[PDB]
């Protein structure tokens, strides 16, 4: 099961990767950075980090900013998968917001990580008829 | 008589909070330098016989009755003459077939059941 | 001026205590205008209460009351000992209590 359900099924898409050969600590900081963004902005941010434009800040494992290429490569593909899952699910692509991106450790085989991403549509409030 | 309890807190073991390997069941402190065994100030209490409750209201639930664990219908019929003194309690391993039969019988007998709403639904 | 008050203002001083051991079960209350243990004999047995605010609408009100009773004088300077149905919180030291006039004998 996915850890969090921050939306409804008709208005969300998920993509995940298990036992990914990367580093758990670097992935956690990248995941913390892109959490809460929009799919269009996150794609721009990950490409910027790749082409030495912006650096991923380190908050818990600072020992500051850096440009982890392996971590962003995994998150770029996972978000592309989640975007594609939104196409097949008939979702709109303008309100797509990364609602819950989480990174968990994997069986030591190194420090592999499990990554899950859930992208939802921007919740809106309709005007009250009064 | 009212059901007076001298103490309501559990007698936690010393340093059961410090360590997860150390359980919270009471163990007398066998140590010879133990400050808490020495009953200093602020040290947590130790089971003494003086906390023992009144022999007249020992084993009594707050409603003045005593729990009598029951496994079938034949057990609740033993409590016919002690319904002001005892309460039936259905065991956790009794199925929902029997639980209904236990509860229905005990209702006519005027016996309180502590867990009569378990494993069942209402239809009315 | 406005009136409608039938109580004597009092302060929750502290608990009954020695130098290092405290007893929350009895509280020390200073009453307005009572400055000796002879005058404190008047207020014995009166009902003292602590009134405070809350957030839940218990029976449609934000008010909450802890009742009590004056038990005996304390010291020489008009302090009294008050027993409350629930022991007063330690955060209410110096708070304002209300010493009603009932039960009355004068």
């Amino acid at each position: 099961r996915y850890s969090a359900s921050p939306a409804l099924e008709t208005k969300c898409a998920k993509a995940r990767g298990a036992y990914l050969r990367t580093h758990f600590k670097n992935s956690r900081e990248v995941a913390f950075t892109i959490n809460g963004m929009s799919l269009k902005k996150a794609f721009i941010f990950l490409d910027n980090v790749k082409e030495h434009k912006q650096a991923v800040p380190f908050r818990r494992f600072n020992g500051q900013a850096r440009w982890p290429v392996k971590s962003v490569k995994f998150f770029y593909d996972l978000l592309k998968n989640a975007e594609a899952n939104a196409e097949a699910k008939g979702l709109d692509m303008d309100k797509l917001i990364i609602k819950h991106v989480q990174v968990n450790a994997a069986p030591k085989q190194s420090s592999p990580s499990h990554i899950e991403i859930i992208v939802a549509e921007e919740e809106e409030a309709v005007p009250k008829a009064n | 008589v009212n059901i007076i309890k001298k103490r309501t807190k559990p007698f936690k073991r010393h340093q059961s909070d410090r360590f997860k390997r150390v359980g919270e069941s009471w163990r007398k402190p066998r140590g010879i330098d133990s400050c808490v065994r020495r009953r200093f100030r602020g040290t947590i209490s130790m089971p003494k016989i003086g906390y023992g409750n009144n022999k007249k209201t020992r084993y009594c639930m707050p409603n003045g009755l005593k729990a009598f664990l029951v496994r079938n219908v034949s057990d609740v019929e033993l409590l016919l003459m002690h319904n002001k003194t005892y309460a039936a309690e259905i065991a956790g391993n009794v199925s929902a077939r029997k639980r209904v039969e236990i509860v229905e019988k005990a209702r006519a007998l005027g016996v309180k059941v502590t867990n009569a709403g378990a494993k069942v639904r209402s239809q009315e | 001026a406005q009136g409608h008050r039938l109580y004597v203002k009092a302060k929750h001083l502290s608990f009954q205590r020695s130098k290092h051991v405290i007893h929350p079960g009895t509280s020390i209350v200073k009453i307005e205008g009572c400055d000796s243990k002879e005058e404190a004999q008047f207020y014995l047995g009166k009902r003292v209460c602590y009134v405070y605010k809350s957030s839940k609408a218990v029976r449609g009100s934000k008010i909450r009351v802890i009742w009590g009773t004056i038990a005996r004088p304390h010291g020489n300077s008009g302090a009294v000992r008050a027993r409350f149905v629930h022991n007063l919180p330690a955060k209410t030291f110096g708070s304002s209590l209300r010493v009603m006039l009932y039960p009355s004998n004068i």
Binding site: - | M81 | Q2, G3, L6, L101, Y102
Partner: protein, 170 residues
């Protein structure tokens, strides 16, 4: 169902006989007492008679609007105001049953208890109003003749800064 089914611990014979209650000395009938608790706190009320435990007191209803009510002698301040002539009004009718509350009943059937629109109101019957008016008639001349009684009873008792009850003499 009559032969006992249980141990039936019969209570040992308690030796607590019921003796008449000795009230205060200052709670003589006709005195003006300040009500301390209840909805009518702070009202000044004339005492009529001394019941077994309480005082049957009432404010002249045309003065302060305090009807005929019981009050415990522990929730009244007995003042030294001059007493009101109350010997002219019968008071023997005010008994325990007179002040008792309506015994629970409300004869109902199992179709109106659901869809609960049958509850009457407990409006005070006429004879209670008539007794109150009769008492007012027998009390008003006594309070009118002596000055300041009418304004005193229509007033309310309330403390202010500088008022110390342990030293004020009521």
């Amino acid at each position: 169902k009559y032969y006992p089914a249980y141990r039936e611990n019969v209570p040992k014979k308690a030796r607590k006989a019921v003796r008449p209650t000795k009230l205060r000395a200052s709670l003589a009938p006709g005195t003006v007492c300040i009500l301390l608790a209840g909805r009518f706190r702070g009202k000044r009320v004339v005492v009529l008679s001394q019941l077994e435990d309480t005082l049957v007191v009432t404010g002249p209803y045309k003065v302060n609007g305090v009807p005929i009510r019981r009050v415990n002698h522990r929730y009244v301040i007995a003042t030294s105001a001059p007493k009101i002539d109350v010997s002219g009004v019968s008071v023997e009718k005010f008994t325990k049953a007179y002040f008792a509350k309506q015994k629970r009943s409300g004869p109902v059937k199992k179709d109106e208890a659901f869809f609960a629109e049958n509850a009457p109101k407990n409006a005070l019957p006429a004879e209670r109003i008539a007794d109150q008016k009769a008492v007012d008639a027998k009390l008003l001349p006594a309070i009118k003749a002596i000055p300041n009684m009418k304004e005193y009873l229509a007033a309310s008792f309330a403390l202010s800064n500088g008022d110390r009850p342990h030293l004020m003499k009521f």
